[PDB]
Amino acid sequence: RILGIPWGFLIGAELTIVQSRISLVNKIQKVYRSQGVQIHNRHIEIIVR
């Protein structure tokens, strides 16, 4: 409702995807870090991509 053609969909998808990736990695790493399991964010970022 704010932006026009290939800007409402383009920018809206970027915001949703960036927000989803940040929360998905945090949620996954919250589980392993509470159990003392250390995994590099590289591996989780590959799955979440």
Partner: peptide, 23 residues
Amino acid sequence: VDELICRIKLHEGDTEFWKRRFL
């Protein structure tokens, strides 16, 4: 009535306008 419709402006393809509204 159609006179009042005539003031509504479409901005399709105007990147500079959408950049201003993005800011």
